[PDB]
Amino acid sequence: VCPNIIKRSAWEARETHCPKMNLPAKYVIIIHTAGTSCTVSTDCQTVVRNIQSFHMDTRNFCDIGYHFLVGQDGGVYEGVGWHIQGSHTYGFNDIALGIAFIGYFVEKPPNAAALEAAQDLIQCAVVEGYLTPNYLLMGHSDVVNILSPGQALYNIISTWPHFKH
Ligand code: NI
């Protein structure tokens, strides 16, 4: 089933009212925050909260851009959740679940804990119906010109199921 998942309230997320996400989604997009990483609950909560603020105040997004985030503490963090539209990839925000690893992974990849959490989340997504049974998995850089989710992480997710080979 779905891994733990720490809620928005847990990281003192600014409350908003954003466009709704249309489920089921047809894709999963692996992203990396490209910023600092985190190894313990409190640190990750902080980093996630800062990203929301940055996305809302200087990027003008309606809320944090990712549906979910994954830390090196192996924990899954709720972004805007399953039901809100994302702000992570042009042309895919209404049909793709954006999952972002907290950190910068071009050279070194996320630990096994982080990776496992992602796949378990992905698994419950398709099982729960948040994703179509024939959904497609892809990396950020496959869709737009972006240095995400990092070659290291890319090489990893490229081997997961439903990856758009
Ligand atoms: Ni599970």
Swiss-Prot record:
Tissue-wise expression: Detected in skin epidermis, eccrine sweat glands and ducts, ciliary body epithelial cells of the eye, in small intestine, colon, stomach and in mature epithelial cells of the tongue (at protein level). Highly expressed in skin and esophagus, expressed also in tonsils and thymus and to a much lesser extent in the stomach, descending colon, rectum and brain.
Induction: Up-regulated by exposure to Gram-positive and Gram-negative bacteria.
Cystine pairs: 2-124, 18-62, 38-44
Domain N-acetylmuramoyl-L-alanine amidase intervals: 24-149
Highest taxon, organism lineage: Eukaryota
Keywords, in A-Z order: Antibiotic, Antimicrobial, Disulfide bond, Glycoprotein, Immunity, Innate immunity, Repeat, Secreted, Signal
Chain spans, region Interaction with murein: 88-93
Residues at which peptidoglycan binds: 55, 59, 66
UniProt PTM: N-glycosylated.
GO BP, sorted A to Z: antimicrobial humoral immune response mediated by antimicrobial peptide; biological process involved in interaction with host; defense response to bacterium; defense response to Gram-positive bacterium; detection of bacterium; immune response; innate immune response; killing of cells of another organism
Compartment(s) of residence: Secreted
Cellular compartments per GO CC: extracellular region; membrane; protein-containing complex
Entry similarity comment: Belongs to the N-acetylmuramoyl-L-alanine amidase 2 family.
Purpose of the protein: Pattern receptor that binds to murein peptidoglycans (PGN) of Gram-positive bacteria. Has bactericidal activity towards Gram-positive bacteria. May kill Gram-positive bacteria by interfering with peptidoglycan biosynthesis. Also binds to Gram-negative bacteria, and has bacteriostatic activity towards Gram-negative bacteria. Plays a role in innate immunity.
Protein's recorded name: Peptidoglycan recognition protein 3
Gene: PGLYRP3
Residues of the full protein shown: 177 to 341 of 341
